[PDB]
Amino acid sequence: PKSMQCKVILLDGSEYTCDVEKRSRGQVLFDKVCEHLNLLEKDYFGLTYRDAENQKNWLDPAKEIKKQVRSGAWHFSFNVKFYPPDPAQLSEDITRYYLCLQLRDDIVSGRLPCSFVTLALLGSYTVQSELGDYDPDECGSDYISEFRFAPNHTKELEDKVIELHKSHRGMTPAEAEMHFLENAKKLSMYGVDLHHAKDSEGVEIMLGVCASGLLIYRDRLRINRFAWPKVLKISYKRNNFYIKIRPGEFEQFESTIGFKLPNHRAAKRLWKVCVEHHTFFRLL
């Protein structure tokens, strides 16, 4: 029975390797990865892979791995797929830990923009969770040299993490990770999957996919939001993506809003993640 080696980059940066039967559905590999991680609240997570255009794609657990990776390597990353709006309602601390690891990478990568103060706060909770109480003996030295807190480190940022770390004496790891998440969940780009697009007039916009719906960034002034319950149908055609909106109260007709994506693969990818968000957050 012929098996393919799978390599999975975990949220701690380490590499998990296993073999699956070459005709395996994605769920088979996902189940092995979640068991490795001791993760029971699996619904929030998924595996990603890179397509022939080096674009990130979700591995569909209900489809054959070979029909998704196609001619590429069986190389994946383990990621948060659906960011919970209220991480306090997750049943397990370890779920919250993996969500923290993902958000830490969202922050360092610059996908999740964050003020100086919130970068320092988040870093101070991570340090408290992983090292425990601030050692007053270290006083001015760098016991935090290995922690990456931001896309760009400054001495001022390091100083501020240490000042806030001192304030968390007695805080336990699940408590510190919960405070991390209570701050991170409030960030305007928390859990937003961003896609470059153009409106029906050709103006460059971004489409954000999240719990709260489909967001439109036209620039820093004039945003828009389509809450999922309003969205009746999501579709794609060639390089175009469409949402059909419920008729408003007293309105005769539905509305369809069209967007141009960078190519056909990009329209199909946006369609799939929107449909998946719409389902997940309808049920949650």
Ligand X SMILES: COc1ccc2[nH]cc(CN(C)C)c2c1
Using CB under 6 A as the criterion, which residues of the chain lie in contact with ligand X when the complex forms? 228-229, 278, 281-282
Least distance CB 279 / ligand X (angstroms): 8
For the purposes of burial, counting CB atoms within 10 Å of the CB of 167, is it exposed (0-12), middle (13-18) or buried (19 or more)? exposed
**Of residues 55 and 212, the one with the C-beta less far from ligand X:** 212
Give the Cα separation of 103 and 113 in Å (integer).
Answer: 11
Least distance CB 230 / ligand X (angstroms): 9
**Of residues 211 and 266, the one with the C-beta less far from ligand X:** 211
**Of residues 58 and 228, the one with the C-beta less far from ligand X:** 228
**Helix (H) and strand (E) counts in the chain:** 7, 12
Instruction: State the residue for tokens 């969205």.
Output: 231
Nearest CA to 81 out of 132, 30, 131, 127 is that of: 30
Give the Cα separation of 175 and 204 in Å (integer).
Answer: 42
Least distance CB 278 / ligand X (angstroms): 5
Measured from each CB, the residue nearest to ligand X is 228
Least distance CB 206 / ligand X (angstroms): 20
Least distance CB 280 / ligand X (angstroms): 8
Give the Cα separation of 248 and 234 in Å (integer).
Answer: 18
**Of residues 37 and 209, the one with the C-beta less far from ligand X:** 209
**Beta strand ranges found along the chain (DSSP E):** 3-9, 15-21, 45-50, 56-58, 75-80, 193-198, 204-210, 213-217, 223-226, 231-237, 240-245, 255-260
**Of residues 226 and 259, the one with the C-beta less far from ligand X:** 226
**Of residues 229 and 248, the one with the C-beta less far from ligand X:** 229
Least distance CB 87 / ligand X (angstroms): 16
**Of residues 72 and 229, the one with the C-beta less far from ligand X:** 229
Q: Are 264 and 237 in contact (CB under 8 A)?
A: no
Give the Cα separation of 121 and 102 in Å (integer).
Answer: 17
Structure tokens at 116: 């100086």
Least distance CB 257 / ligand X (angstroms): 17
